[PDB]
Point group: C2
Chain length 588, copies 2
Amino acid sequence: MRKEAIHHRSTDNFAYAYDSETLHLRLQTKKNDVDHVELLFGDPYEWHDGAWQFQTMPMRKTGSDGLFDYWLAEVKPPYRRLRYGFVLRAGGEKLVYTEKGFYHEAPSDDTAYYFCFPFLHRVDLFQAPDWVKDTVWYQIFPERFANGNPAISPKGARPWGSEDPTPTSFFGGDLQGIIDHLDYLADLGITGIYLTPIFRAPSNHKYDTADYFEIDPHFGDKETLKTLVKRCHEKGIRVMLDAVFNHCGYEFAPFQDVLKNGAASRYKDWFHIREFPLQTEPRPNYDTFAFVPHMPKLNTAHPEVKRYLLDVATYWIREFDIDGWRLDVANEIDHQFWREFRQAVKALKPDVYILGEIWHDAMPWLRGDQFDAVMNYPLADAALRFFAKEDMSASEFADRLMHVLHSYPKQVNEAAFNLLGSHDTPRLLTVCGGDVRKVKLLFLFQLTFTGSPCIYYGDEIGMTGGNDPECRKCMVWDPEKQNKELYEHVKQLIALRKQYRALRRGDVAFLTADDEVNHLVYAKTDGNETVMIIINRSNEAAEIPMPIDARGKWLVNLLTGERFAAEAETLCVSLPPYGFVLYAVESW
Amino acid sequence: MRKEAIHHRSTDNFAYAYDSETLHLRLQTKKNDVDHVELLFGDPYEWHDGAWQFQTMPMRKTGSDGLFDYWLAEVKPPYRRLRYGFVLRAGGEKLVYTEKGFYHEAPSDDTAYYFCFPFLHRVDLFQAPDWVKDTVWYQIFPERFANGNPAISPKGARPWGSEDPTPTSFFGGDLQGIIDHLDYLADLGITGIYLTPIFRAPSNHKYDTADYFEIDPHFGDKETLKTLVKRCHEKGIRVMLDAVFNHCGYEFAPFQDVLKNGAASRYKDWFHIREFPLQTEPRPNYDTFAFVPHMPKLNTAHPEVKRYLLDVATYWIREFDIDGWRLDVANEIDHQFWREFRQAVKALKPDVYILGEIWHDAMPWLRGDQFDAVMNYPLADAALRFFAKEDMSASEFADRLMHVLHSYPKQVNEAAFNLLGSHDTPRLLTVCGGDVRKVKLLFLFQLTFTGSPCIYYGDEIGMTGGNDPECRKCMVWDPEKQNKELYEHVKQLIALRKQYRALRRGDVAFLTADDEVNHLVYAKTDGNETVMIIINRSNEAAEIPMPIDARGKWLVNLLTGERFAAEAETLCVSLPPYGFVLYAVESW
């Protein structure tokens, strides 16, 4: 029973608290090494006859990447304290994995033997706002969405050639634009907009931030903004702004002051100037975003700086009732600051959503003391790798999916910002080879996957751009130039979700085969709810089977309505080339 | 090359920052599955020709429990940001482990492939006070050390029968006692005392705390205390007090007020009263330490409570310049509080030592935001399991040792409170079967192991008690009743340590054999320093071999002085029954 594969730890995803009364304890073991695995537990203060008392509950397998299995144990310890170990049996073999080691039997003379969860505290419980779990985000890039009261920059009118626009130059877009096409989104079905930086800055992208307290004139003013919000909350849309605290622009006052003062500048330590005489020759002589001189790294460890950004994070939450905060290059900021950030904002408006940009494992930030979630780029990676590049397979995709999924405690996943692209990646369509057949499948996956998804403005109407900055083309508002077939598709999925719980906040369950490299079928479940999803990632009609539960009464096809009855053990679903279909099993 | 064994994560012990310029990245693999394993790295912003640039450094094996190996990579990333992957080669096989998965080759088109350490920040660096790394703790239990100005409780005079004392009753001990025998310790060589609760409380153990701001009259007063400290700092001893914040006593004012007010008590939420009418019938109807009615659990999540204990933690640090804080049942307190605790105390007197009582894995508390270390009980477990019970073997002991050791980032270990017993466990001697031969070996291990050790007052002079409360017998101040042979032993080890760096803050390295179940030989190293330690955990003379380095010039035996020369590849060390010996290899 290969012990190198078995593993557990009383921290993070392997062990955490779901609610103020339940704990989640997951055990990782080899592929199909263990046929079982019970959870041995008891209060660390429960004894009898000088022997630590404890009972054992069964743990069920909940997935498995390519090599491991992952089991789970939902236990509500009485008095909130509990000591535990695992009893995995693979036939005649019986082991008793414990924090101390393995045992052919369960030690009872001491508690020190087993792993331990001291005390379940609500305060340490990871709790993201419950509302983000039901919404569908739409991220707009102001400088390219919709032009309003032309108080814009003197340059390039709307769109150019069918191809070649987006020249790292302004097109006129502004905040007034969003306020106008608000009904377009309200029709589509999005329940929240995440919009790129809109604070005073000399650039088509306000990342070179010059004044965190003043909205770039070009986009508008506090009034224009005050409207966008009012109107949105009216429609049921939450506005999420972008916080660029990791750095500033060559125009930021303090930094500008480190040029007409230097070492005398009261803002010398506001940055990371290793050597003075501020020389950005071969490259900046101070820390910058990448190597961007016009992007000095701020010193968040500095009391003043820390007090500045923190007054900024609360300003726009007070003066504009915004419902979130996106953190640009959030992973490059000292953990200390973020807990202070979370304390301020969650103290002001507890419902604010703190999202951090982290294209990699962000466990260190999702412990409940900092972020509420991150821009889930790893999932997108897997999605694009399957449907777009068609690199991996249905089983590998299912694995890599069951993987990243398990590397976090449920609640964390239940609030994941599941995007597929953004102002920083090639357009979804160009990535699909122009085959809107695939794009339709991707939207089907995302809008079918639990979490808090987000659509990149252009991508819903068959837009095409590719790698940055081509991915920020001006929005296509031409009813003739925009794929309504695709737009319609996304609109029915967003609603299919809004009404089918399991789709937005339920547990997945893949059913892939090693031989059938192109057949993906998974079931979103949530209590009695079940919404199966068949998919033929092929370019030739296929016959993908789908098992129906005997307890099922009906089998209503979504997006079409064809509602039939189970009465079978399996149902060979026939699909066209890159076809797909959804089913919502009943119960009787 | 079994992939189930390989594993890494960009968090905790597997990856962390040692200093403000160096990172430690450890890779775990199967037993002897990999003959090598290089560290592939580079700045996440280092590109060329649309390809992410990176170089590769070799990683060395630094240990291995029973199944794994653990490798290590010391890298100082330029600009403080770095993306990495591992290249493990086992013969012809070559894998490229990455956060995304395995690859027969190193992907270069994207950085998203590899693991990532965003930014090395001093503020997030785990830094315990450098002084605790050189000291040797001595923990006294006031109510049983030395009687001073008899302002004690009316009961039992000093000691009783050779056996049967310690009846859960006071013997008269007090703070004046310590101030008197301070030279005894100053001779022994201890550089700091950790003393059990001394705050007003009706009990031989002040855990039923009744007033965190007032020293139990019986022990003395602010003056007596002010002296103990002054005197200690004079001798080079740091005083560490015990903080009992997880609960209080049936006499604590607030709780006492929840009896003459009940629901009207302004202190109703100061505790965890599930049901009112406060009934501790079959057992408390509110949360308690174990099930101790006279020990109500405090509510640290409450602003007032939180503000109370936090004013207590700083009081005795201001008014008495104490150098530490022991946290009783620290693991049962909400992580939130501890970061607030650390912020207060480290803000007042940064050098204060925050120690937490956790008899199990405390990674969640040793991230640099809460504790400086914990009462390392797992190590003691292994030590007693080897030398006392003689349960496991020399190789198993070495493994379990290399295990717990690797489950933490170095700096954490370098400040571990390595004790072997305390007021809560059977006496070291009784645990050795009265065989002071073993006790001498245990002291040899501990005082030879890196970290910040601590001796339980009685244990140094061949005292004997056993399981609580027998382990709190009155100190044996009788020159005739106290084993001077053992006392002398400990005194020469404490000095052997005080002068030989590698012993207190260096890296270990076991050399055990599968056949020779009773021969343990390890080398403490630190730069040029090397102090070998041979040990024959047997009851019959043995011939344990010890390899000498060719670069070695001398080979001075410690505790005896016999200094000879290497001139060999190995040196068959002959030892008596439970003998042992230390060597300090030279260099030339």
